[PDB]
């Protein structure tokens, strides 16, 4: 029921600009945090961005801090990632995932991704 | 900065035997780690969260243990449907860092 | 006022605190004088039009781990975000808050397992608004089946009154299974007390200490229950009718009884802690009684045998007429008489 | 004006000034260079790394305008955290706690913050400081501190302090996990030492964090206009974070008080087992050496002939008694 | 009329009349000099110490019109703290506590606050008080002390006496750390004597906090005879401070109880280790004593004779038994 | 737990009311009928002389001591219209403190304790109060109460007791009882302080018995205090029509006193358990000293016997002939072993 899909992956020349759209079904993007993760062929997973559409909470990866731009629009109930000035290493599979918070101690919270999108490909 | 080194790089084991993957954190993470399964060409699945808590609707052969700042993913009885890549995670900070990725084969 | 800012989270984040994420369900029971329904479902949007119903309604949302459903229900029913944060904070004590439209109650139910002595706690929240009662739990399996059966089969007064009697019935059922749990712990404490004196091992100590900690948990979660029932009985906010206060008074007396029982159990376990040490000292006493008896009987014999078995060049008593049998006879006599002497008391 | 701090060798003065678009960093030891900073309309921060020298603190107090009693509190180190409101300035008392994982001890160092008009005075004790994040934030403008007055500077200082509290709590959490694993796996007297020291550290942490709650409460709930209404909500967040610390602390005590109890009761349960060992061995070997001495009597009266393996018969009787005693111990389940 | 106190020492009457314009410090010693200090509009602070001088206290009670029953309550020492409300004046009775070195026992001194119009009176007995912070606040232009009436004076005296408990608990914590070091290394009988004395002092502190909280609750809730409001929000930090004191004393009691329990553990472990050494020695040397007794047995026909000069063989058997038994002990914590 | 009907014991005829306590020696009725300007104190033994005070306009305090005479209790209950179940509760000593609100009267069961030295058990006596209209009936088991201050206040017109109604009299009696409870707790504390020295200095079986009976007494004290605090809470937070709502602050003061007493008794129980632990430690140290002497003797002698036997062997092939006179060598070896034993026991800091 709860399914995440991605669109916008394509053959774009390095240094260009494009937009990845993560469409959500079975839930409301307002009530959960949406993460974008990048995995290169032959390499492990690498988290990229996190958006909490309820507030302005927006946290990008350390490596690509300030070069991406994540947001979410509730009218379409989707999340958006804007990629600008791509590098050569950015070619990989992109996954869009829900994530819920869980409680460990009073001071420390964790979170987990329960539903993972299929994940487009960017070159 | 914080990083999670996952050992070993890869592991080979038979079916029905215990498999253990350890994972160490550069900075102390309270308990916010997770273990995932990724079949090739497919989205990852969430196996373990909170470093010891089995996910809802997942076989109990997987188990998680925490000792200090080190985390171990253990398997009671490995299965043919259990040959994939297993990762770590961090959720202590808003910056999420993944593990190296240990692939288990026959 | 305001939803507390937890750092490390986006502002205004509602997070489930417990551990049970397995199941999620919504069960609706709309009952009246004549007709009733049971609309069990999962689509939350179907439950909503019951807020403004004329007849009393019982909504039961199991699995509060889905915070979106809780937020949507709270927003549509006009529930303050602080109340929602209290709902999703399982780590809490029973409490009551009175508001201009709804009454919010936090209570705890407990289960006990045999062969694995774990006192499992599940927090349940009640929100009485207008002529409806919202119920929030986090796992399948509660102690409100008698209320459902009474409503379904029209037995008792519950089908005749308003939603306030429904809330009273729910709290009464909670106190009833509190009594059931106290009886179960009574049986377990009797078994543990009998066992600790006959087979004292370290697992008995672990069981006794686990029972003591469980009882401390029970006390810390029952005294707030006394407080909340007191708050429900005395001031009787406008949401609760004046004719339904004697029922809450009865529940208050029940909570008094439960507190007395748990305090008695706490005293009993505190006694068992010293009883275990006394029993282990008794066992050590038995072992050293055996050791001291053999020592007392056979060390003097040993040294006298050593003394007559010596290499002096003299010839004191080595050729007397059967002197060896004489020594053995007198020596056995002294051993027998000292064993008889030790036969007094409980040493032998 | 008597100084009681245990740090004397360290001393340095550093100034960070900033505006909407420009900032300036200054480092010195002579106080004459930091005197003229009143005229800067833009907010500024002056940090005194070492407060052992009473002359500099007395001069700065009489220059910016600081009450004798609050200055004596600044010089005093053993003081509960506190907040005082004056028309000219506000005065706040904070603590910083460093805790080494390998070398287990939770130390402390006192900080005093004074906010008069736009200059924020911080009176650090010694070297080794936490507020590098706010210094880097104001060095490289990636925040909101540029658009606000020194009030937001005070808020940033206090927020950095509570963040350091969170990091210390993470360290204590790791120590508690390790201690619990050790207790469940293998006890020791040094394990008991660890439990006691951790308990004491938690107790002192609770005692020192609880006043900070009412410090922040005084700082937002009925705050004077010197801290500014727009700055008030930010302090609220700090207050909320403080609650978490307290909550965490209490649950840690709840998990460390009960850690050691099973070991406390479990002692004297090995006493009976060592009695088992000593008693079985003494029971075997008291009668055995007893009859050894009996046959070593050197009486020679009773015939000691070769017989039908008389010495092997004695040994066989000895072994029969030993087997009988072993059977008796098996029956007793000792 | 009757004096109950057992302390007869120096007698002193001090008056501290303070106002915005200035403050008066002519405490003097004349009994009749205080009588004109009653019609002043300013808050007049009259204190009498050494209540053994019964004629002076009787005269001042007659002058200010206190009920003689309240005078009898003042003359009492063993009286639980409480508050009584009258139209002319309000009576408060409370306890002052001071810890000391040597005999680690804490004593109590009654203090009576009679507040009427713009006048406040203390009825202390022993020389040596704690209200110095309020005195220096009066003398050093700090706080709202002068901007308000004698109600603020009562509030300041009572919350200073509440703050006394923090100093006392710091003293008790120092004592607890000393006893912690002792239990850490040297356990003796004096150790449990002094730890149990500390436990008694802590339960005494809880028992004396209870009436103080009751007094604050009774004084907070309405029925103000002379209080004109605007001071009852100040009777909110005092109640919270009472809660603070209760919780900190509870933690101190818990840590002292843990110290007692670890002493008990040390005694049990000493029993265990003495048992262990005895068992090791007897266990390893008794079978050897047996075998030494057996061989060389005295009978006519000895068949052992010589087996390849086997005395080194039996010695090596002894050594092998000894080393394997030592290894068996070493594999455990023996 | 619904409806109130008389319980049926099988050893008695159906309606008979039985006294449960163990006192029969005393019986006396004291009537104390006061007003703003007058008071009549009247001690008698006739039940029929107190009946007119039911309809008295002025407040009156009846005090019947010796409830063992069930006929007097039954007659007074019949005249004052008291329910028979309340009479059975009055005569039933073996019950906890409680309060019952009725349409015409309020019924309270409370306890007064006494502590004796050289007989370290506390004795409880049940006192019952019935407040009805303008009369306060008091039922006591035996001579000896704790309401002397109230009597002096009524006699000598101290305080404000005379000008008020019977509800203030009920307050005064309950306050006096709680003050006596405070005195009792002080006596328990003194007994605990005395027992501390013996339990950490004089380890005997009598100390064990004394501490265990103190723990039992503390348990009984808690079991009495908790319902008493419940009674005071009910009087404060239920305000029945007989209390006039003006005397409620007095009841909250008594409620605070009860709360303090309950906390005190809990702390005392903790202290008693600590005393038991210290006892065990003391006896363990005694046994440790005895084990020390046993162990040192055994380890300085038994190995010496081992070597003595080893070179006490007698077969053909041994260097038994003197080498350096031989025997002094073995004696010196034994002495050196003993000296090593003693020196490392000195190192181990016990003899
Ligand atoms: Mg010989
Ligand atoms: Mg021997």
Q: How many angstroms separate the CA atoms of F124 and F325, rounded?
A: 85
Specify whether the CB–CB gap between E56 and E48 falls below 8 A.
yes
Q: How many angstroms separate the CA atoms of E204 and E207, rounded?
A: 5
Residue D215 forms beta bridges with which residues? none
B69 at interface of D, judged by CB pairs closer than 8 A: yes
Q: What tokens does F253 get?
A: 């003061």
The CA F300 to ligand 1 mean position distance, Å, reads 24
In this structure, the number of other CB atoms found within 10 A of the CB of residue D330 comes to 9
Q: Are strands B10-12 and B102-105 parallel, antiparallel or unpaired?
A: parallel
Chain D residues with CB inside 8 Å of C299's CB? Answer: 286
Specify whether the CB–CB gap between B66 and A9 falls below 8 A.
no
Q: How many angstroms separate the CA atoms of E74 and E82, rounded?
A: 12
- Contact (CB<8Å) D247/A106: yes
Q: What tokens does A101 get?
A: 């918070």
Which residues does A contribute to its contact with D (CB < 8 Å)?
Answer: 105-108
| Alpha-carbon distances, residue C237 vs C102, C240, C241, D66, E39 (angstroms) | 10, 6, 8, 53, 51
Minimum distance, in Å, between the CA of residue E187 and any CA atom of chain F: 11
Q: Residue C143: which of C165, C120, C159, C160 has the closest Cα?
A: C120
- Contact (CB<8Å) A59/B95: yes
- Contact (CB<8Å) C250/F222: no
Q: What range defines the domain where residue B17 resides?
A: 5-106
Which residues does D contribute to its contact with B (CB < 8 Å)?
Answer: 170-171, 173-174, 177-178, 181
Chain F residues with CB inside 8 Å of E268's CB? Answer: 284
**What's the number of domains chain B is made of?**
1
Rounded (10°) CA dihedral D243, D249, D252, D257: -130
Where do we find the tokens 């603020």?
E152
List phi, psi (to 5°) of F330: -65, -40
Interface of F with E in 248-267 (CB under 8 A): 253, 256, 259-260, 263-264, 267
Where do we find the tokens 């080595």?
C318
Minimum CA–CA partner of E279 in chain F: F295
Cβ-based neighbours of F223, under 8 Å, separated by 6 or more:
F96
Q: Residue E261: which of A61, D295, D264 has the closest Cα?
A: D264
- Neighbouring chains to C with at least 3 Cβ pairs closer than 8 Å: A, B, D, F
Q: Inspect the structure and tell me whether chains C and A have 3 or more CB pairs less than 8 Å apart.
A: yes
Q: Residue D22: which of D42, D38, D36 has the closest Cα?
A: D42
| Alpha-carbon distances, residue D234 vs C301, D144, D240 (angstroms) | 89, 12, 10
Angle between helices D132-139 and D150-185 (to 10 degrees): 140
Q: How many angstroms separate the CA atoms of D166 and D159, rounded?
A: 11
Q: Mutating which of F255, F309, F345, F351 best tests the E interface, going by the most E Cβ atoms within 10 A?
A: F309
The SS3 of residue D121 is strand
Chain D residues with CB inside 8 Å of B29's CB? Answer: 170
DSSP H helices, F239-247, are none
Chain B residues with CB inside 8 Å of D170's CB? Answer: 28-30, 92
Where do we find the tokens 């004590």?
C93
Residue C134 forms beta bridges with which residues? C59, C127
Q: How many angstroms separate the CA atoms of D253 and E251, rounded?
A: 10
Which residues does A contribute to its contact with C (CB < 8 Å)?
Answer: 27-28, 31-33, 52, 54-55, 57, 100-103, 108-109
- Tally the residues of chain F: 351
Q: What tokens does D200 get?
A: 């004491």
F298 at interface of E, judged by CB pairs closer than 8 A: yes
Q: What tokens does E216 get?
A: 């604050």
Q: What tokens does B95 get?
A: 């910056």
Q: Are strands C102-112 and C95-98 parallel, antiparallel or unpaired?
A: antiparallel
- Contact (CB<8Å) D299/C318: yes
Q: Is the dihedral of CA F227, F230, F236, F238 positive or negative?
A: negative
Q: Tell the burial category of F119 from Cβ atoms under 10 Å away from its Cβ (0-12, 13-18, 19+).
A: exposed
Cβ-based neighbours of F103, under 8 Å, separated by 6 or more:
none
Minimum CA–CA partner of F296 in chain E: E278
Specify whether the CB–CB gap between C134 and C48 falls below 8 A.
no
Minimum distance, in Å, between the CA of residue C11 and any CA atom of chain A: 6
Q: How many angstroms separate the CA atoms of C135 and D51, rounded?
A: 59
Chain centroid offset of residue F101 CA? 28
Interface of E with D in 85-124 (CB under 8 A): none
Q: What tokens does D299 get?
A: 């009486």
List phi, psi (to 5°) of D219: -80, -15
* Full 3-state SS string of chain F: CCCCCCCCCCCCCCCCCCCCCCCCCCCEEEEEEECCCCEEEEEECCHHHCHHHHCCCCCEEEEEECCCCHHHHHHHHHHCCCCHHHHHHHHCCCCCCEEEECCCEEEEEEEEEEECCCCCCEEEEEEEEEEECCEEEEEECCCCCCCHHHHHHHHHCCCCCCCCCHHHHHHHHHHHHHHHHHHHHHHHHHHHHHHHHHHHHCCCHHHHHHHHHHHHHHHHHHHHHHHHHHHHHHHHHHCCHHHCCCCHHHHHHHHHHHHHHHHHHHHHHHHHHHHHHHHHHHHHHHHHHHHHHHHHHHHHHHHHHHHHHHCCCCCCCCCCCCCCCCHHHHHHHHHHHHHHHHHHHHHCCCC
Q: What tokens does E27 get?
A: 């405490």
Residue A73 forms beta bridges with which residues? A78
Q: How many angstroms separate the CA atoms of F277 and F187, rounded?
A: 23
Q: How many angstroms separate the CA atoms of E274 and F350, rounded?
A: 10
Give, as residue ranges, everything with CB less than 5 Å from ion ligand 1.
Answer: C 311; D 298
Chain C residues with CB inside 8 Å of F231's CB? Answer: none
Say which ligand is closest to the CA of E293. 2
Interface of F with E in 201-220 (CB under 8 A): none
Cβ-based neighbours of E276, under 8 Å, separated by 6 or more:
D274, E334
Q: How many angstroms separate the CA atoms of C125 and C109, rounded?
A: 10
DSSP E18: B
Cβ-based neighbours of E323, under 8 Å, separated by 6 or more:
none
CATH code of the domain containing B21: 2.60.40.10
In this structure, the number of other CB atoms found within 10 A of the CB of residue E233 comes to 10
C309 at interface of F, judged by CB pairs closer than 8 A: no
Cβ-based neighbours of C156, under 8 Å, separated by 6 or more:
C150
Specify whether the CB–CB gap between C53 and C30 falls below 8 A.
yes
Specify whether the CB–CB gap between F221 and F113 falls below 8 A.
yes
The CA A77 to ligand 2 mean position distance, Å, reads 90
Specify whether the CB–CB gap between B27 and B97 falls below 8 A.
no
Q: Experimental method used, please?
A: cryo-EM
Cβ-based neighbours of C11, under 8 Å, separated by 6 or more:
A55, A57, C5
Cβ-based neighbours of E154, under 8 Å, separated by 6 or more:
E92, E113, E115, E120
- Contact (CB<8Å) E142/D257: no
Q: How many angstroms separate the CA atoms of D175 and D169, rounded?
A: 10
Specify whether the CB–CB gap between C248 and C237 falls below 8 A.
no
Chain B residues with CB inside 8 Å of A33's CB? Answer: none
Q: How many angstroms separate the CA atoms of A16 and C120, rounded?
A: 57
Q: What tokens does F141 get?
A: 């088991």
In this structure, the number of other CB atoms found within 10 A of the CB of residue F193 comes to 11
End-to-end CA distance of chain D: 72
C276 dihedral zone (left: phi>0; alpha: psi -120 to 50; beta):
alpha
The SS3 of residue B21 is strand
Q: What tokens does D221 get?
A: 């709930």
Specify the DSSP element, H or E, that contains E326: helix E311-330
Q: How many angstroms separate the CA atoms of B88 and B67, rounded?
A: 15
In this structure, the number of other CB atoms found within 10 A of the CB of residue F156 comes to 10
Say which ligand is closest to the CA of E298. 1
Q: How many angstroms separate the CA atoms of D75 and F100, rounded?
A: 63
In this structure, the number of other CB atoms found within 10 A of the CB of residue E28 comes to 12
| Alpha-carbon distances, residue C42 vs A59, C24, C48, C323, E190 (angstroms) | 33, 8, 12, 102, 69
- Contact (CB<8Å) C234/F237: yes
In this structure, the number of other CB atoms found within 10 A of the CB of residue F335 comes to 11
What are the respective helix, strand and coil percentages of chain D, to the nearest 5? 55, 10, 30
Q: Residue E56: which of E9, E111, E121, E11 has the closest Cα?
A: E11
Can you point out the beta strands (E) in E154-283?
A: none
Q: How many angstroms separate the CA atoms of F109 and E279, rounded?
A: 62
Q: Are strands C57-62 and B45-49 parallel, antiparallel or unpaired?
A: unpaired
Q: Is the dihedral of CA B38, B44, B45, B47 positive or negative?
A: positive
- Contact (CB<8Å) B30/D171: no
Q: Residue D271: which of C288, E327, C209, C206 has the closest Cα?
A: C288
Interface of B with A in 50-89 (CB under 8 A): 50, 53, 55, 85, 87, 89
Q: Tell the burial category of B100 from Cβ atoms under 10 Å away from its Cβ (0-12, 13-18, 19+).
A: buried
- Contact (CB<8Å) B68/D178: yes
Q: Tell the burial category of D39 from Cβ atoms under 10 Å away from its Cβ (0-12, 13-18, 19+).
A: exposed
Specify whether the CB–CB gap between C179 and C258 falls below 8 A.
yes
Q: Are strands B62-67 and B19-25 parallel, antiparallel or unpaired?
A: unpaired
Chain centroid offset of residue C72 CA? 34
The CA F296 to ligand 2 mean position distance, Å, reads 14
What are the respective helix, strand and coil percentages of chain E, to the nearest 5? 55, 10, 35
The CA C320 to ligand 1 mean position distance, Å, reads 17
Specify the DSSP element, H or E, that contains F194: helix F166-201
Strands of B4-7's sheet in order across: B4-7, B19-25, B70-75, B62-67
Q: Which long-range contacts (CB under 8 A, 24 or more apart) does B62-66 make?
A: B62/B35, B64/B35, B66/B31, B66/B33, B66/D177
End-to-end CA distance of chain C: 75
The per-residue DSSP string of E255-281 comes to: HHHHHHHHHHHHHHHHHHHHHHHHHHH
Q: What tokens does C235 get?
A: 């001031």
Cβ-based neighbours of C69, under 8 Å, separated by 6 or more:
C24, C26, C44, C61
Is-cis flag, bond preceding F229, omega within 30?
no
List phi, psi (to 5°) of E39: -90, 0
The per-residue DSSP string of E82-124 comes to: EEEE-SS-EEEEEEEEE--SSS---EEEEEEEEEETTEEEE--
Model resolution, angstroms: 3.4
Can you point out the beta strands (E) in chain B?
A: 4-7, 10-12, 19-25, 34-38, 45-49, 53-54, 62-67, 70-75, 85-87, 102-105
DSSP A119: -
CA angle centred on C108, ends C103 and C109, rounded to 5°:
125
- Neighbouring chains to A with at least 3 Cβ pairs closer than 8 Å: B, C, D
Chain C residues with CB inside 8 Å of A102's CB? Answer: 15-16
Residue A59 forms beta bridges with which residues? A50
B14 at interface of C, judged by CB pairs closer than 8 A: no
- Contact (CB<8Å) D311/E303: yes
Q: Are strands B4-7 and B53-54 parallel, antiparallel or unpaired?
A: unpaired
Chain centroid offset of residue D4 CA? 22
Closest partner residue to C274 (CB to CB) among F1, F222, F276 is F276
């Amino acid at each position: 029921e709860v399914q995440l899909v991605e669109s916008g992956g394509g053959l774009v020349q390095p240094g260009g600009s494009l937009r990845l759209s993560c469409a959500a079904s079975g839930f409301n993007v307002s009530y959960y945090s949406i993460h974008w993760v990048r995995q290169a062929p032959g390499k492990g997973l690498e988290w990229v961005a996190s958006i909490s559409s309820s507030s302005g909470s927006t946290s990008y990866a350390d490596s690509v801090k300030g070069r991406f731009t994540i947001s979410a629009d509730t009218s379409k109930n989707t999340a958006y990632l804007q990629m600008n000035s791509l590098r050569a290493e950015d070619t990989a599979v992109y996954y869009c995932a829900r994530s819920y918070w869980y409680y460990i101690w009073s001071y420390s919270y964790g979170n987990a991704m329960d539903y993972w999108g299929q994940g487009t490909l960017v070159t | 900065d914080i990083q999670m080194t996952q050992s070993p790089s890869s592991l080979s084991a038979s079916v029905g035997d215990r498999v253990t993957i350890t994972c160490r954190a550069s900075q102390s993470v309270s308990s916010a780690v997770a273990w995932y399964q990724q079949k090739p060409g497919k989205a990852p699945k969430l196996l373990i969260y909170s470093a010891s808590s089995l996910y809802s609707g997942v076989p109990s052969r997987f188990s998680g243990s925490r000792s200090g700042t080190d985390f171990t993913l253990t398997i009671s009885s490995l299965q043919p449907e259990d040959f994939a890549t297993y990762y770590c995670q961090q959720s202590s900070s808003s910056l999420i860092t993944f593990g190296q990725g240990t692939k288990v084969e026959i | 006022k305001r939803l507390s800012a937890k750092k490390g989270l986006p502002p205004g984040t509602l997070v489930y605190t417990g551990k049970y994420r397995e199941d999620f369900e919504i069960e609706v029971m709309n009952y009246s004088i004549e007709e009733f329904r049971e609309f069990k479902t999962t689509d939350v949007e179907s439950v909503l039009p019951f807020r403004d119903s004329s007849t009393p309604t019982w909504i039961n949302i199991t699995g509060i781990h889905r915070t979106d459903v809780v937020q949507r229900v709270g927003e549509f029913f006009g529930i303050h975000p602080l109340v929602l944060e209290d709902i999703l904070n399982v780590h809490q004590r029973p409490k009551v808050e009175f508001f201009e439209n709804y009454v919010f109650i936090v209570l705890k139910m407990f289960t006990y397992d045999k062969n694995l002595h774990e006192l499992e706690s599940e927090q349940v929240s009640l929100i009485l608004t207008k002529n409806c009662v919202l119920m929030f739990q986090e796992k399948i399996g509660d102690v409100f089946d008698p209320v459902r059966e009474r409503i379904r089969y029209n037995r008792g007064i519950i089908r005749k009154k308003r939603a306030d009697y429904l809330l009273y019935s729910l709290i009464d059922a909670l106190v009833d299974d509190y009594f059931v749990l106290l009886e179960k712990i009574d049986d377990e404490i009797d078994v543990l007390e009998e066992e600790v004196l006959e087979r004292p091992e370290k697992e008995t100590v672990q069981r006794t200490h686990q029972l003591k900690r469980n009882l401390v948990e029970l006390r810390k979660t029952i005294w707030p229950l006394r407080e909340v029932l007191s708050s429900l009985y005395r001031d009787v906010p406008p949401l609760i009718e004046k004719e339904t206060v004697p029922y809450f008074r009865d529940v208050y007396d029940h909570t008094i009884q439960i507190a007395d029982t748990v305090e008695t159990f706490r005293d009993i376990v505190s006694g068992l802690l010293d009883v275990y040490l006394s029993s282990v000292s008794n066992k050590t006493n038995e072992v050293m009684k055996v050791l001291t008896i053999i020592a007392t009987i056979f060390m003097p014999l040993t040294f006298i045998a050593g003394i007559y078995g010596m290499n002096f060049e003299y010839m004191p008593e080595l050729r007397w007429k059967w002197g060896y049998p004489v020594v053995l006879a007198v020596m056995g006599v002294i051993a027998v008489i000292m064993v008889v002497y030790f036969k007094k008391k409980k040493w032998l």
